[PDB]
């Protein structure tokens, strides 16, 4: 059944709750972003109102074939009324189209639902600065102090410098980047930019990217693999067997592959820095795991919550085990006692 952490009290609303059939008492289904664990269940047969960003609406229409009459896109940073309730959509700094949602309940309670987010100090100057938030529905993916990772900028600088060096030493090296969803487009676009190439990909992935309102996108991507020296493949193909196989397909145009797997966290983060990362190598193939995160580190999450000072926190991630729930509750109490709210 629909879990309580997916329901907004005092409303008929639900958030990211499309796999339970008809939720009794739901008048509007919000969708924070186009990731499959969140949209699971949507299709062309859905006949209730879906509220979301413009970009998420583009993907629902073109990729899932949801009918236009049920898609309700909202602009960001704008007070909107939905079924008699004031709401605002904020940029979540996750993947393209991803939002946080502010609900203003008729009784005066203000609720923030973060969706999936990477907390940033820039959020402290959004419309969130303007009133008190009583209840926070929080993306707790990395809520434990072992989870450190570098800035996105630092990671992109490493990837750009590595690729440019490799290809300038060997003009017959191919760069391959893995993907299994939207997000992390900066990794492959930044590398293609330094190399003066477009990125080449399947027809399905090109279609997905043409939904994202990325400026000058026609200048940066292509379905013609032969003309491109940055290829995107399914994350599943980023291993030595999959990459050897891919290299056969290019007809002796290339004699070396340098591949990037943008992971979330990996336990080499507790010891090693970004400057010190090394690849796994077999023969003429090298694979780099780079810690490019679209979720809060522990310290980013803690700073956001200690700034916001909510009265009650409702985790939305890692809620399935008692040991996870208890650990998270301990951190929330620590944060509250340190900051004095």
Q: What does the binding site for Ni ion look like in residue numbers (CB under 5 A)?
A: 35, 116
DSSP string, 122-136: GGGGSGGGGS---EE
Instruction: Kindly state the smallest distance separating residue 94's Cβ from Ni ion, in Å.
Output: 6
State how beta strands 199-200 and 71-73 pair: unpaired
Q: How far is the CB of 32 from Ni ion (least distance, A)?
A: 8
Which CB atom, from 116 or from 300, has the smaller least distance to Ni ion?
116
Is the Cβ of residue 180 or residue 341 nearer to Ni ion in the bound state? Answer: 180
Is 246 or 295 the residue whose CB approaches Ni ion more closely? 295
Q: Which is nearer to Ni ion, 55 or 258 (CB)?
A: 55
| Minimal distance, residue 277 CB to Ni ion, in Å | 24
Which residue from 107, 15, 88, 9 is spatially nearest to 312, judged by alpha carbons?
Answer: 9
Q: Between β-strands 85-91 and 80-82, what pairing exists: parallel, antiparallel or unpaired?
A: antiparallel
143 vs 227: CA distance, rounded Å: 43
29 vs 117, beta carbon nearer Ni ion: 117
Q: Which of 192, 157, 162 is nearest to 279 (CA)?
A: 162
What's the CA gap between 288 and 279, in Å, rounded? Answer: 5
Q: What is the dihedral of CA 110, 14, 52, 62, to 10 degrees?
A: 170
CB of 34 to Ni ion, least distance (A): 9
Cβ 16 to Ni ion shortest distance, Å: 10
Q: In the complex with Ni ion, which residue's Cβ is closer, 97 or 200?
A: 97
Least Å from the CB of residue 306 to Ni ion: 24
Q: Least distance (Å) from Ni ion to the CB of residue 182? A: 9
Give the residue among 259, 265, 263 at the shortest CA–CA distance from 287.
Answer: 259
Task: Report yes or no: 35 and 52 within 8 Å, Cβ to Cβ.
Answer: no
- Pick between residue 38 and residue 261 the one whose CB is nearest to Ni ion: 38
Angle subtended at Cα 228 by Cα 224 and Cα 233, rounded to the nearest 5 degrees: 80
Strand order in the sheet with 312-315: 80-82, 85-91, 99-104, 110-113, 135-138, 312-315
């Amino acid at each position: 059944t629909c879990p309580f952490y997916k329901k907004i009290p005092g409303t008929g609303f639900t958030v990211d709750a499309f796999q339970y059939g008809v939720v009794e008492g739901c008048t509007a289904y919000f969708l924070t972003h186009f990731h499959s664990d969140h949209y699971a269940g949507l299709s062309k047969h859905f006949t209730f109102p879906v509220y979301c960003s413009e970009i998420t609406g583009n993907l629902l229409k073109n990729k899932l074939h949801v009918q236009e009459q049920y898609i309700h896109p909202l602009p960001l940073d704008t007070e909107c009324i939905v079924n008699g309730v004031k709401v605002v959509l904020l940029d979540a700094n996750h993947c393209p189209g991803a939002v946080m949602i502010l609900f203003y309940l008729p009784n005066g309670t203000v609720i923030l639902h973060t969706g999936d987010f990477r907390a940033d100090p820039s959020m402290e100057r959004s419309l969130l600065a303007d009133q008190k938030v009583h209840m926070l529905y929080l993306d707790t993916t990395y809520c434990s102090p072992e989870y450190t990772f570098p800035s996105q900028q630092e990671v992109i600088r490493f990837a750009i410098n590595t690729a440019f060096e490799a290809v300038t030493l060997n003009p017959h090296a191919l760069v391959v980047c893995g993907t299994y969803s939207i997000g992390k487009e900066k990794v492959f676009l930044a590398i293609a930019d330094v190399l003066g190439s477009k990125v080449g990909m399947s027809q399905e992935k090109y279609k997905t990217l043409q939904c994202l309102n990325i400026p000058e996108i026609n200048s940066l991507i292509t379905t013609d693999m032969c003309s491109s020296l940055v290829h995107l493949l399914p994350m599943m193909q980023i291993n030595f067997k999959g990459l050897q196989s891919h290299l056969k397909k290019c007809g002796g145009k290339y004699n070396q592959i340098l591949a990037f797997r943008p992971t979330g966290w990996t336990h080499s983060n507790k010891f090693t820095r970004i400057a010190d990362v090394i690849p796994q190598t077999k023969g003429n193939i090298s694979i780099y795991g780079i810690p490019y995160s679209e979720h809060s580190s522990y310290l980013e999450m803690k700073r956001f919550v200690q700034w916001l000072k909510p009265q009650k926190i409702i985790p939305t991630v890692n809620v399935g085990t008692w040991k996870s729930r208890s650990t998270m509750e301990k951190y929330f109490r620590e944060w509250k006692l340190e900051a004095g709210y």
